[PDB]
Amino acid sequence: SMSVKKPKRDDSKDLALCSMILTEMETHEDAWPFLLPVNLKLVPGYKKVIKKPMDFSTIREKLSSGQYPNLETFALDVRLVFDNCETFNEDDSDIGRAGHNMRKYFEKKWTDTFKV
Ligand SMILES: CNC(=O)C(C)(C)C
């Protein structure tokens, strides 16, 4: 509360570390469905169903332009990518499988990087 500060983690390297994690995501062989925004003019249903589209290139742009206030808002957008993917794709499809794989990949790197 007022004048009662918790000791808080050193967040000075967060931007660099999130960029490193995003780079590993971008270079994963299963990243291809997520590299660019879904084309809302070519994919029936997507605009109406997926209320907040997100993709790696959009995350990279927001990261590079100071649009994430903190590391949690970055993680929310990454997770949004895979939550959208689950909403629109069957688990037993290539993109569906890609999404689950990429989510798993992200969450381990997230834990390994920031959860001490
Ligand atoms: C991530 N891509 C998708 O979810 C499709 C709309 C199926 C192309």
Swiss-Prot record:
Subcellular location as annotated: Nucleus
Stretches assigned to the Bromo domain: 9-113
Known tissue expression: Expressed at varying levels in several tissues, whereas a smaller transcript was expressed specifically in testis.
Subunit note: Component of the BRF-1 ISWI chromatin remodeling complex, at least composed of SMARCA1 and BAZ2B, which regulates the spacing of histone octamers on the DNA template to facilitate access to DNA. Within the BRF-1 ISWI chromatin remodeling complex interacts with SMARCA1; the interaction is direct. Component of the BRF-5 ISWI chromatin remodeling complex, at least composed of SMARCA5/SNF2H and BAZ2B, which regulates the spacing of histone octamers on the DNA template to facilitate access to DNA.
Sequence similarity: Belongs to the WAL family.
Function comment: Regulatory subunit of the ATP-dependent BRF-1 and BRF-5 ISWI chromatin remodeling complexes, which form ordered nucleosome arrays on chromatin and facilitate access to DNA during DNA-templated processes such as DNA replication, transcription, and repair. Both complexes regulate the spacing of nucleosomes along the chromatin and have the ability to slide mononucleosomes to the center of a DNA template. The BRF-1 ISWI chromatin remodeling complex has a lower ATP hydrolysis rate than the BRF-5 ISWI chromatin remodeling complex.
Name of the molecule in the record: Bromodomain adjacent to zinc finger domain protein 2B
Gene name, Swiss-Prot/TrEMBL: BAZ2B
Span covered, complete protein: 2054 to 2167 of 2168
